[PDB]
Copies of this chain bind each other. A is one copy, B any other.
Amino acid sequence: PVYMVYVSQDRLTPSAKHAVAKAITDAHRGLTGTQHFLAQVNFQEQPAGNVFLGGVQQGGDTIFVHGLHREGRSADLKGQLAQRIVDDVSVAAEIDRKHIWVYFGEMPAQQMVQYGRFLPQPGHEGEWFDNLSSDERAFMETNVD
């Protein structure tokens, strides 16, 4: 998946960003079975005061997670995954759950590309990984924490 994480400038130190990224990745690995190295977390920092709720300008405390996944998982699984991201980003970012927004969008795996390769259907990541060239496997395997 690709998790776009919209935060304020300097709300997360390099260490907190790392912890939030592990937490999102670990929740996704644990609830779906997708390998660590297939999950991207992309932080988008903007100056504080660029978020408005109900038209009221906010401080640096909001977090919006926009998760981009492939189709095929149940609504039950996606709800569990959304809820664990709320809980685990709360802890990792030391941020109250009330400050956290999370949206999941889905598209066919047939129009999703990671590492220059088309993605398999969810559940089939063992295959697909095994049918990748040695260089590609080794290169993906560096992205495990």
Question: Hey, which bits of chain A sit against chain B, CB under 8 A?
Answer: 2, 6, 14, 17-18, 21-22, 25-26, 35-47, 49-58, 62, 64, 66, 68, 75, 78-79, 82-83, 86, 90, 96-108, 110-116, 118, 136, 139, 142-145
In the complex, what's the smallest C-beta–C-beta distance from A128 to chain B, in angstroms? Answer: 15
Q: Are A40 and B52 in contact (CB under 8 A)?
A: yes
Contact of A116 among B18, B100, B113 (CB under 8 A): B100
Contact A145 B54, CB 8 Å, known A64-B42, A107-B105: yes
Q: Are B118 and A82 in contact (CB under 8 A)?
A: yes
Contact A101 B56, CB 8 Å, known A111-B75, A111-B82: no
